[PDB]
Structure formats: C-alpha cells, structure tokens
C-alpha cells in the first residue's frame, strides 16, 4: 500500500486516445495530393483568435496542427517511407510547435503575407515602475483618477508568487516604496512576465514566422528564411 491517491473528478470532458492521432495520420497524407503547397510554420506561443483569424481568412488554405512525431509519422520521417516524394527533408525542419498549411493560391502571396501580418501579444521591451501608493489594476497606464484599485483576492498571490511587498491598509491595496518590475534590453523572467500579465500589458508585438515550402508537381524542397 502507501500509494499516491490520484484526484478523481466529475467534469464533462473526456480523454481522446490514439484514435485522434491516427486521424491526423490520415489527414496529412490525404492533403498532399489534394492541395499543391506545403507550408510549415514555427509558432511557439499562440493566441486563439490569432489562430482563428488565419483559419477564416484563408478558405483555400487548410491549417492542420498536431503533435510533431505524428507529422513525422504521416509525412514520413525517413527517406525510405514517405507518401509523396522529396518530402523527408522538410519534415526534418519542424522542431518546434508546427502546424502545416495547404494552400493553392501563390508562392509569392504566402511569403508576403506573414511579413505583412503582425499582431500584439504578451511579452513572455519597455520598463515599468509602480508608484508608492495605491496600486491599480491598470498599473499607471491610464490616469489613476479613472483607475480601479486591485482586487484583494490576488493580493496574497502578489505577496507570495509575484514577490512584490504589499501590506494592506483599508479596502484598497498599498505599497510604500516604488518598485520597478523590468528594465529595457533584458530578457524577462517568468515572474516578470506574469506581473505584466495581471496588469494587462501586451505591448510586445507578435508575428508568425515560416521556414520552408514544398511544391508537389515540382517535387523539390524550398527553404525560405523570414522571421
């Protein structure tokens, strides 16, 4: 005995299994002879309306995402086994979180789009000092006369997880010394990014980068480097 007691729940959603893997094994091999362009895209951090923007903007494209080794299983990782030919070099490149794209419009439009397409997400850049008074949920962005004081439930979250010293006088939250969370030109810590997350500061821009292209009729591997 003396085993770990696992937490049992009652939620609605259930686990997928292997049968969702083998469908993505089939949908990748089906999309090769159907569409003409194979675009592999490295995109590590994503936001869901960013992804739901790219899906609905392009009807001719099919943006198929999944596990990496399933994509190696379906495209064929070794040169000996592959669905269509000259395909084992481009599947070597997908090392990060990658989702394949199957369009048929142009090779110039796709490579032009993602440099033109840019968004803004969390920083995960500019520095921020907190005033030594009542802290607000915007955090000195907008004028504090219109601001909202922070909810005191996340104040124990601030004293323990964010390491920021907050002692509380009355219904609002107070700090007594001015505190800066980041400095410019520095790689941000994960505790520094979560301060900017609770403050709602997504002031670092986001863009998706693409790494390679394949054409079925030409049957050759094309590598393009844009960030």
Partner RNA sequence: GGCCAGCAUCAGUUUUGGUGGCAGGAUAAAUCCAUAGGAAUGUAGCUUGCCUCGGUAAGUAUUAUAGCCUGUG
Partner RNA sequence: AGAACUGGCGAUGCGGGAUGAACCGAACGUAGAGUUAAGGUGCCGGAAUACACGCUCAUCAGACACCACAAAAGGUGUUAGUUCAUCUAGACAGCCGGACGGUGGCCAUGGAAGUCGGAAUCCGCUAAGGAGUGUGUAACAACUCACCGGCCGAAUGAACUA
Partner RNA sequence: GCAGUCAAGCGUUCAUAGCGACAUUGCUUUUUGAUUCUUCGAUGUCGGCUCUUCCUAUCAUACCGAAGCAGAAUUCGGUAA
Partner RNA sequence: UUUGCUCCACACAAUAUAGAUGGAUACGAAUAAGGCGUCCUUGUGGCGUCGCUGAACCAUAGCAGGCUAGCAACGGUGCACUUGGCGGAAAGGCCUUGGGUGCUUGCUGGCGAAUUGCAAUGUCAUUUUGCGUGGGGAUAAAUCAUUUGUAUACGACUUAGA
Q: Which of 34, 52, 57, 109 binds RNA (CB under 7 A)?
A: 52
Closer residue to another protein (CB): 41 or 135: 135
DSSP assignment string, 44-66: -S--HHHHHHHHHH-SS--EEE-
- Residue 209 makes contact with RNA by CB under 7 A: no
* Contact partner, 115, from another protein, RNA, none, Cβ < 5-8 Å per class: none
CB-CB contact of 111 with 47 (8 Å):
no
* Contact partner, 165, from another protein, RNA, none, Cβ < 5-8 Å per class: another protein
Q: Which of 108, 116, 153, 177 binds RNA (CB under 7 A)?
A: 153
Q: Which of 163, 186, 189, 205 binds another protein (CB under 8 A)?
A: 163
**Min CB(43)–RNA separation in Å:** 9
- Residue 177 makes contact with another protein by CB under 8 A: yes
Tokens of 126: 């500019």
Q: Where are the beta strands (DSSP E) in the chain?
A: 37-42, 63-65, 98-101, 119-121, 129-130, 179-180, 204-206, 209-215, 220-226
CA atoms within 13 A on the CB side of 34: 12
Q: Which stretch binds another protein (CB under 8 A): 22-30, 69-77, 104-112, 159-167?
A: 159-167
222: helix, coil or strand? strand
């Amino acid at each position: 005995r003396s085993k770990r007691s696992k937490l049992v729940t009652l939620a609605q959603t259930d686990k997928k299994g292997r049968e969702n893997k083998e469908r993505i094994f089939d949908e990748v091999r089906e999309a090769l002879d159907t569409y003409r362009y194979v675009w592999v895209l490295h995109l590590d951090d994503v936001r869901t309306p960013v992804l739901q923007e790219i899906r609905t903007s392009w009807a001719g494209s099919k943006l198929i995402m999944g596990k990496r080794k399933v994509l190696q299983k379906a495209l064929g990782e070794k040169r000996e086994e592959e669905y269509k030919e000259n395909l084992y070099q481009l599947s070597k490149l997908c090392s990060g979180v990658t989702g394949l794209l199957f369009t048929d419009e142009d090779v110039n439009t796709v490579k032009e789009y993602f440099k033109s397409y840019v968004r803004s997400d969390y920083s995960r850049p500019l520095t921020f000092t907190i005033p030594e008074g009542i802290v607000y949920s915007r955090g000195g962005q907008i004028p504090a006369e219109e601001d909202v004081p922070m909810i005191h439930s996340l104040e124990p979250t601030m004293r323990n997880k964010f390491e920021i010293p907050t002692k509380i006088k009355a219904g609002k939250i107070t700090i007594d010394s001015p505190y800066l969370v980041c400095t410019e030109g520095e790689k941000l810590d994960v505790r520094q990014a979560l301060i900017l997350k609770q403050f709602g500061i997504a002031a670092s821009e986001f863009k998706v980068k693409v790494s390679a292209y394949y054409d079925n009729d030409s049957s050759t591997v094309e590598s393009t480097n844009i960030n």
